[PDB]
Structure 1
């Protein structure tokens, strides 16, 4: 039994459209759905074509990492846009980020196809088979396409991209369904006041099934809240299973006290310090005590200091690129997380800024 006249269906996909400067990312996202919420990321909704699809354009990357990492941690499928001759520093940084995230499901869009030739595209596909070997991208399809209605081959490859997104989406729907039996968690990416509605948050159910009228909590505030209604693609629903992009009206909390990164759930860890078992990228600088990193967990991102580095429980003066270590980290702000949440560490002053992933010890 469910609300309304026709069940939602577990038909949905949340897709991140990412990549380097001048890669056709925004034009692709903009031609795949209707412009919705827009901050440092922009949602393009499309519930007109079978799935409730949300495409998130990380338009503030490469300027900021938060734009990219937010788009990624609310999405289940990544479309990495690489333009002709587009093997540059940011395409490399995106590949490294996806691989440090263990991001399973994606597609390479070889954009701007009308600006290039088959034989060049075949050479770039060959190249990418190399760069992505032994990474999570290794078996991602590369689809050549453009979004130029005036080209000789207008919108070639867009139908093929969409068909591959739907194939991957079907696999993710089964994976997310397995998570329905877990306790609900919802990650919030936006919060605002709505006249006559009060506190509304937008987010995605990460696991479990969130139900209308649930009495639960919000973290890191650690405050009791009630879910007054859940909306998906403009329609109120009684329940929202894992994977569902939601808008929720909340009782007992004010939008001004919520930030992107807050979590609705019955229990989360809240700390300002972290002890992480980390795997350091081969493509970063050795990590040293008392140095500065940026930490991302869920949809949160804050500066941290490395207090202590251990290898085999013994304290060391460095963690080399491409090594494993424990990092004791300290920070100012209280963050919420559970142990399943992958942490990413960055050095914002580098060229390739991603340093490591880790999990709470």
Structure 2
């Protein structure tokens, strides 16, 4: 039994469209759905073709990492856009990030196909098979495409991209369905007041099934709240299973006290210090005590200081690139997370900024 005249169905896909500068990312996203929410990232919604699809353009990247990380942590499928001769620094950083995130499902879009030739495209695909070997992108399909209605072959590859997205989405739907039996958790990516109905948050159910009228909590505030209503692509629904992108009206909390990264659940860890079992990127500088890094977990990001570095329980003076260690970190703001949330560490001053991934010990 469900609300409405027809169930929503288990058909949806949250897709992140990312990549280096001038890679055709925005043009692709904009041609895949209609522009909706826009901040440092932009949602393009398309629920007119079967699945409730949301494409997130991380348009503030490469300028900021949070744009990229937020887009990836609210999506289940990544589309990495690489233009002709596009093997540059940020394309490399994107590959590293996806791999440090253990991002399972994705596709590489070899954009701007009308500006190149099949033989060059075959050569770029060959190079990529190599660059992605031994990474989570190793078996991702590479699809040549363009979004130029005036090209000799207008929009070639777009139909193929859509088809592959739907296939991958089918696998994701089954994986998310398995999470329905867990306690509910919703990551909030936006929050604002709406005249006539108050506090509204937009986010995605990460696990379990959130239900209209649930009495739960919001973290890091650790405050009781009630879910007044849940909307999916503008229609009220009685429940929202894992993977569902939602809009929710909340009772007992003001939009002004909610930030991207807050979590709705019955329980979350809230701390300002962290002890993480980490794996350091081979493509970063050795990490040392007293150094400063940037931490990302869920949809939160903040600077942190390295207080202590240990290996096999013993304290050391550095963690070299490509090593595993335990990092004791300290920050100023309270962040919310559960043990299953993967942490990312970065050094915003480097060229390739991702330094490591880790989990709370």
Equivalent position of 1:204 in the other structure: 204
Q: Deviations over 1:177-220 (max 9, x none)?
A: 00000000000000000001100000000000000000000000
Distance 2:133 2:292 in 1: 31
Over residues 311-361 of structure 1, what are the superposed CA-to-partner deviations in whole Å (9 max), with x where a residue is unaligned? 000000000000000000000000000000000000000000000000000
The CA deviation at 1:167 is 0.1
Give the Cα–Cα distance (whole angstroms) in 1 for the partners of residues 116 and 340 of structure 2.
Answer: 43
* Structure 1 Cα separation of the partners of residues 237 and 126 of structure 2: 46
Which residue is 1:314 aligned to?
314
Deviation string, structure 1 residues 213-244 (Cα, Å, up to 9, x no partner) = 00000000000000000000010000000000
Q: Which residue pairs with 1:213 in the alignment?
A: 213
Query: 1-side partners of 2:305 and 2:100: how far apart?
Result: 20
Partners of 1:93 and 1:66 lie apart in 2 by: 13
Deviation at 1:18, TM superposition (A): 0.1
Mapped partners of 2:293, 2:343: distance in 1? 12
Deviation of 1:86 (Å): 0.1
Deviation at 1:262, TM superposition (A): 0.1
Work out the CA distance in 2 between the residues paired with 1:345 and 1:197. 38
Per the alignment, residue 86 of structure 1 pairs with 86
> 1:128 Cα shift?
0.2
Task: Write the deviation string for residues 95-130 of structure 1: whole angstroms up to 9, x where unpaired.
Answer: 000000000000000000000000000000000000
Give me the whole-angstrom Cα distance separating, in 2, the residues matched to 1:43 and 1:125. Answer: 29
Aligned-partner Cα distance in 1 for 2:59–2:182? 33
2:23 alignment partner in structure 1: 23
CA displacement 1:46-70 (0-9 Å, x = unmatched): 0000000000000000000000000
The number of residue pairs the alignment matches comes to 361
1:91 offset after TM fit, Å?
0.2
Instruction: Please give the alpha-carbon distance, in whole angstroms, between the structure 2 residues aligned to 1:184 and 1:256.
Output: 24
| Runs of 5+ consecutive residues of structure 2 not aligned to the other structure | none
Q: Deviations over 1:245-269 (max 9, x none)?
A: 0000000000000000000000000
The TM-score, its normalising length taken from structure 1, stands at: 1.00
CA distance in 2, matches of 1:197, 1:99: 41
Q: Distance in 2 between matches of 1:29 and 1:12?
A: 16
Could you tell me how far 1:142 is from its partner in structure 2? 0.1
Residue 155 of structure 2 is matched in structure 1 by 155
- Does the residue aligned with 1:96 lie in a helix, a strand or coil? helix
Q: What is the Cα deviation at residue 282 of structure 1? A: 0.1
Instruction: Find the aligned partners of 1:33 and 1:273 in 2 and give their Cα distance.
Output: 40
Could you tell me which residue of structure 1 aligns to residue 46 of structure 2?
46
In 2, the alpha carbon distance for the partners of 1:197 and 1:355 equals 43
Structure 1 stretches of at least 4 aligned residues deviating more than 2 Å after TM superposition: none
Question: What is the TM-score normalised by the length of structure 2?
Answer: 1.00
Question: How far, CA to CA, are the matches of 2:193 and 2:346 in structure 1?
Answer: 33
User: Which residue of structure 1 lines up, in the alignment, with residue 137 of structure 2?
Assistant: 137
Structure 2 CA distance for aligned equivalents of residues 232 and 281 of structure 1: 38
Q: Secondary structure at the match of 2:295?
A: strand
CA distance in structure 1 between the partners assigned to 2:294 and 2:10 by the alignment: 36
